[PDB]
Design a protein around this nucleic acid. Structure first.
Lengths: 206, 262, 64, 50, 143
RNA sequence: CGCACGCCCGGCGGCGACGACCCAUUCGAACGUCUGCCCUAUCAACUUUCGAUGGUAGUCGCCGUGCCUACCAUGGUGACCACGGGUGACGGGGAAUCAGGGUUCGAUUCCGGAGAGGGAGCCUGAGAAACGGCUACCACAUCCAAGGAAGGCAGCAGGCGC
RNA sequence: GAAACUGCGAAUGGCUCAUUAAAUCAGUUAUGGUUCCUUUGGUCGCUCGACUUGGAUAACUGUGGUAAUUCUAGAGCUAAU
């Protein structure tokens, strides 16, 4: 059907090839997955050798990684902002590999607070009134507190990250082919990558 | 071709089988196994053509379905099972044991061995490997995977394995000054002492071999088998002892034995 | 695809000039003296000799 | 329009031929696998649904 | 200077967001006695298809032509000359076969006429299968 | 699932058959590298904004790749014969003829390719774009209670036509 | 031990040369850029949380359709690697 072959298109010299055989199967080709954002929907494609290949047609969750301290959590994709290849893949917000998405910052914040015993986001004059957040931020023995005061030293977050946390949504880049593995796994944008992409989103936006 | 091929025509059959033309159209396409299609000896060929125990492929079928023939200490009820190099074929009811090692010419000789020698075989290691728990792995020339080997054995050595346990006893390192039988190319069956190895990064490394009588010949490294340390082979050899004398010498020896018979 | 030979070969060569008096006379003297049945049986022995002489020549040209 | 009429729990069945129009006039514009009362078919078929 | 294309250009193996308190570079010697040149180690360019600072393995053939054209993007046309031997007339005939070959920005200045050594790699584009591995400046070319 | 039936206080296990994610192996397959083909100039310029040659990121595929999307770059080939046209052209191992060179043939039993009336599309399976598989249309064509049913000899024989 | 369900094979073999002019094909190398039934050899108490479970279907039994085909609808009974 959808042919994936070299013999259908002109030689290096601009001379036409006359096809010496009809379409073979291994010269295969199938329609594009076109993965949207919605409730989990995955169809299975049986491929050469009797192996499987999962078509994610809708996805909500995704395994994203805060790379600077090896904090990976399953979060909830909310929307797409910028795609490098094509900008109709933004309009009809398709999930493809290496597209910029926004994710829920809540599992990263929860880990950050429970690891450093310091607040992240939570704007000045934050009423922490359930006060089991204050349990996670206070009430230790002696030597355990020494370990936690030792560690809070190197919890200096990049201001670019700290804004996104306080807004409540982080930028991430999809590192897995979602149309072939049925997964929207990626990494949270940081440093020079983040400054590059934040310029690109603002510039395009206007 | 829309899939794997199952018929092998008699003219396409490997030449070392010495199959006659006017018998049929086909030869026995060897069933998949440890050795390659091209370089094996199918059990029907060895049993019917070489030994002359059977006359037809149906007679060979009638033998091999009584569990008589044992290849490498396991019963093989497949008449086109590929029996290749170094393989040990023990028939119990007759009380006879054969090791398939090459004639001095490019074919398999029918070399009888003793009950005590038909208990092991030499395997050329093909690739060393680490498994899924830092467990080291060997792969041999006859498709055997041996795990937890000796930590010195490397990619071109020879190992002596036992045909009950399938475990490594002793091994011969691939060095200069070690006996090697040549198991591929023009020099097929030539025994000699390794003189040199010539390294070519990206290409096939050629290895110089010295025969007993000062005959020097090269072969690609792949087609060499270290069968002994020094001049001492760890197996028994056919009559000739892998020299491959010239055609003028073979004539002289033939008509010497002829005229002596008279 | 059958189990047959197809390996046949002519064992004689007809001479170029069909009516040379000296050649007719030569061949009849062989036919009569030895009681051959026809010319072919003489041309056959010419051809076998011609092959042997060719193989001798082709080895004699090779350096000793 | 013959009727292949089978009783399951009995496990017996019979071909019963029809040539009264009015009997069949109910069955029309139904779909397959719907229970329909045979009270109308004949007086031996009374309180029956097929 | 770099990152002209819409997607962010990085050597994808090296990680550049290690928390602290120069950028590192990934490269390799590509075997067969080729000196991984100085620009590979001390450049700041990004290339998928550089044999030194990229994901291509050199294996198979090692051929050599003369640089003919340098008018396409990180690619050049070399011209390979040989003598084909006709059998009937016991003489040769001068033939040629020019191939599109991938030039890394590693080799900073090559001039049309320079001698190139090329290593076979996987197919890089429609017609590109070879990589420039060392350049030998054409006869003289000092001034 | 099948044969052998066992070894102590209701205790107590060997040969095989079948099956299985992964690994190597065997059989391959697939897409690439370098060099190689007949006649033709009454075929000298050809290819490209609907892929032509490259770059980046995707899509798809068993995988590498303009294979195909989007945005960029102006490239690729050519008197060393490109582009186009012709073949009573499937390629090769080989065959006939020969002093030495050579010329002509190779549908034809071995290897490789392509096709099953002409194109196209697919199910099942490890492997098929299969035709002694299915689904359409084009050409032909069989059987009809006229509503419908069924086709594929360039398999072995055999019939018409040529 | 017929039938039927299941498993495997039917992609090989055979036939012809219409296509096809760097295409096919031949020698030479690459997969460090892939898939692989079958075979042979490894693996298969590596995991920390029932002395054998379930509801259908065929062959079979019976009731039928249209002129027709290797068309098959309906009912009752029963299996599994």
């Amino acid at each position: 059907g959808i042919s994936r072959d070299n013999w259908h298109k002109r030689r290096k010299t601009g001379g036409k090839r006359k096809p010496y055989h009809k379409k073979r199967k291994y010269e295969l080709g199938r329609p594009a997955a076109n993965t949207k954002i919605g409730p989990r929907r995955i169809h299975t494609v049986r491929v050469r050798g009797g192996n499987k290949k999962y078509r994610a047609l809708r996805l909500d969750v995704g395994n994203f990684s805060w790379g600077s301290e090896c904090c990976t959590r399953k979060t909830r994709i909310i929307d797409v902002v910028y795609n490098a290849s094509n900008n109709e893949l933004v309009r009809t917000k398709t999930l493809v590999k290496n597209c910029i998405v926004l994710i829920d910052s809540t599992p990263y914040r929860q880990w950050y607070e429970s690891h450093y015993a310091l607040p992240l986001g939570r704007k000045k004059g934050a009423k922490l009134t359930p006060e089991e957040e204050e349990i996670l931020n206070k009430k230790r023995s002696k030597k355990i507190q020494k370990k936690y005061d030792e560690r809070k030293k190197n919890a200096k977050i990049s201001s670019l990250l700290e804004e996104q946390f306080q807004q409540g949504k982080l930028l991430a880049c999809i590192a897995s082919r979602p149309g072939q593995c049925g997964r929207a796994d990626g990494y949270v944008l940081e440093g020079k990558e983040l400054e590059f992409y934040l310029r690109k989103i603002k510039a395009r936006k206007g | 071709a829309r899939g794997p091929k199952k018929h092998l025509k008699r003219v396409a059959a490997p030449k070392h089988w010495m199959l006659d033309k006017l018998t049929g159209v086909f030869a026995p396409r060897p069933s998949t196994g440890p050795h390659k299609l091209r370089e094996c000896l199918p059990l029907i060929i060895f049993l019917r053509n070489k030994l002359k125990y059977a006359l037809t492929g149906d007679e060979v079928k009638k033998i091999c379905m009584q569990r008589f023939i044992k290849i490498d200490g396991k019963v093989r009820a497949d008449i086109t099972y590929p029996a290749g190099f170094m393989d040990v074929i023990s028939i119990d009811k007759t009380g006879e044991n054969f090791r398939l090692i090459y004639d001095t010419k490019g074919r398999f000789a029918v070399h009888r061995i003793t009950p005590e020698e038909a208990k092991y075989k030499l395997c050329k290691v093909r690739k060393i490997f680490v498994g899924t728990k830092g467990i080291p792995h060997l792969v041999t020339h006859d498709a055997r995977t041996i795990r937890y080997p000796d930590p010195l054995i490397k990619v071109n050595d020879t190992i002596q394995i036992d045909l009950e346990t399938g475990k490594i006893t002793d091994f011969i390192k691939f060095d200069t000054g070690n006996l090697c039988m040549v198991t591929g190319g023009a020099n097929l069956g030539r025994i000699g002492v390794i003189t040199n190895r010539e390294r070519h990064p990206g290409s096939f490394d050629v290895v110089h071999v010295k025969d007993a009588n000062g005959n020097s010949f090269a072969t690609r490294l792949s087609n060499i088998f270290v069968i002994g340390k020094g001049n001492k082979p760890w197996i028994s050899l056919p009559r000739g002892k892998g020299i491959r004398l010239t055609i003028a010498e073979e004539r002289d020896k033939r008509l010497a034995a002829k005229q002596s018979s008279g | 695809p059958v189990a047959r030979s197809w390996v046949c070969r002519k064992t004689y060569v007809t001479p170029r000039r069909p009516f040379e008096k000296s050649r007719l006379d030569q061949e009849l003297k062989l036919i009569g003296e030895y009681g051959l049945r026809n010319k072919r049986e003489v041309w056959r022995v010419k051809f076998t000799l011609a092959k042997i002489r060719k193989a001798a020549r082709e080895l004699l040209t090779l350096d000793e | 329009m013959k009727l292949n009429i089978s009783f399951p729990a009995t496990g017996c069945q019979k071909l019963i031929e029809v040539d009264d129009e009015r009997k069949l006039r109910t069955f029309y514009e139904k779909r397959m696998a719907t229970e329909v009362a045979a009270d109308a078919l004949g007086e031996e078929w009374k309180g029956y649904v097929v | 200077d770099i990152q002209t294309e819409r997607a962010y250009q990085k050597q994808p193996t090296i990680f550049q967001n290690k928390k602290r308190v120069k950028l590192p570079r990934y490269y390799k010697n590509i075997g067969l006695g080729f000196k991984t040149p100085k620009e590979a180690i001390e450049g700041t360019y990004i290339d998928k298809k550089c044999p030194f600072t990229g994901n291509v393995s050199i294996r198979g053939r090692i051929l050599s032509g003369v640089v003919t054209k340098m008018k396409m993007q990180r690619t050049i046309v070399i011209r390979r000359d040989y003598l084909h031997y006709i059998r009937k007339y016991n003489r040769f005939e001068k033939r040629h076969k020019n191939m599109s070959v991938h030039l890394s920005p590693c080799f900073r200045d090559v001039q049309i006429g320079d001698i190139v050594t090329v290593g076979e790699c996987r197919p890089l584009s429609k017609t590109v299968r070879f990589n420039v591995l060392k350049v030998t400046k054409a006869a003289g070319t000092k001034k």
